[PDB]
Amino acid sequence: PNVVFIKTEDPDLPAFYFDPLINPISHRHSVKSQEPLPDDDEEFELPEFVEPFLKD
């Protein structure tokens, strides 16, 4: 288990900052969903009437 750790320089960055050290994320181009999905009349019938996850 190679212990990979992003050792930052100074505490000016946020905690979860993508350091330009690893690689491009995916360089993905095969995914294509420019049109809307079909299950929207069903998603429209699927409300979320309760508070969100960790807004506070």
């Binding site: 320089e9 100074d10 350091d19 330009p20």
Partner: protein, 134 residues
């Protein structure tokens, strides 16, 4: 309230009465002193950009070094091409009395010669001469 904006043309007409302004015997120098005097989250983001650029430069240098190492392992050895050239000289050639040009004209009909496409004709002739000498 001076910053880097403020103009001496404007400040002058506001302080020209003070005994501390007149106390400088020159206008060229009251202006220089004025020019000198004139010069967290956003600074954190600027340091972010700086550290990102530094890491990017270091990674680019490391990648250039690795690419140089690969190109050297190819040219100094492309090791497969030199090995295939020596192997063709060993297999298709066994008598040191033949020449490099005649040997090339004979081996051009073979399909293994195409494997040595990455190497130049000079290096190929040199390897054939070394094999004939051995």
């Amino acid at each position: 309230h001076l910053d880097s904006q403020s103009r001496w043309s404007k400040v002058k007409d506001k302080v020209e009465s003070d005994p501390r302004y007149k106390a400088v015997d020159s206008s060229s120098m009251r202006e220089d002193l004025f020019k000198q005097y004139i010069e967290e989250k956003e600074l954190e983001r600027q340091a972010r950009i700086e550290a990102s650029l530094r890491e990017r430069e270091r990674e680019v240098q490391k990648a250039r070094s690795e690419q140089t190492k690969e190109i050297d392992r190819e040219r100094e050895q492309r090791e497969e091409a030199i090995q295939n050239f020596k192997a063709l000289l060993s297999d298709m050639v066994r008598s040191s009395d033949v020449s490099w040009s005649d040997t090339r004209r004979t081996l051009r009909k073979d399909h293994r010669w195409e494997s040595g496409s990455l190497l130049e004709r000079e290096e190929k002739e040199k390897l054939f001469n070394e094999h004939i000498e051995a």
